[PDB]
Amino acid sequence: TATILLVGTEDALLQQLADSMLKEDCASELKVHLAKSLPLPPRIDLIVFVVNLHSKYSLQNTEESLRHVDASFFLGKVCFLATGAGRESHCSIHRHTVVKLAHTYQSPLLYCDLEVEGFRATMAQRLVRVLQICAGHVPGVSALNLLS
């Protein structure tokens, strides 16, 4: 009844995030699809671009994939999720690049270390709520209202 597309090149992290989102409990029935890239080879309510700040390939793949997304998706139905930004080991230039990306496509930029169980759990809560909003399940709040 609410469907999210996770786009990212790290299968394992996408899977653990998906599992985190599916972890109990949710009033709506959540479906998760994963893609390594866009364009894809089903109704999709929310797209989350998971960007690995330690991987230049991740950045490039996000940048390229974005070109295939219809503009109506950026009306609150796209979120960026940067991983590695809280770590001193990450490249600052990449972080700036993704901040500029999220700004350009006027979409939220969220940060999480997906390798940390608790942090990923909380982020999954946030994303479940955003997904429900985008799917029209939250009274008085549409994807349009997410725009800020």
Numbering used by the authors: 15 to 55, 61 to 167
What do the study authors state?
We generated crystals of residues 1–171 of CENP-M (a fragment identified by limited proteolysis) and determined their crystal structure by the SAD (single-wavelength anomalous diffraction) method to a resolution of 1.5 Å using a SeMet derivative. Structural superposition with representative members of different families identified Rab proteins as the closest structural homologs of CENP-M. Thus, HsCENP-M has the fold of a small GTPase, but may be unable to bind (and therefore hydrolyze) GTP. Experiments with MANT nucleotides confirmed this prediction directly. CENP-M is devoid of all essential sequence signatures associated with nucleotide binding, hydrolysis and conformational switching of small GTPases. Thus, the first step leading CENP-M to diverge from genuine GTPases might have been an impairment of GTP hydrolysis, followed by the loss of other features associated with GTP handling. In conclusion, we identify CENP-M as a ‘pseudo G-protein’, in analogy to inactive kinase domains, indicated with the term ‘pseudokinase’. CENP-M (∼20 kDa) elutes as expected for a monomeric species.
The CCAN (whose subunits are indicated as ‘CENP’—for centromeric protein—followed by a letter) interacts with the outer kinetochore and contributes to maintain centromere identity by participating in CENP-A loading at every new cell division cycle. In this study, we elucidate the molecular basis of CENP-M's essential function in kinetochore assembly.
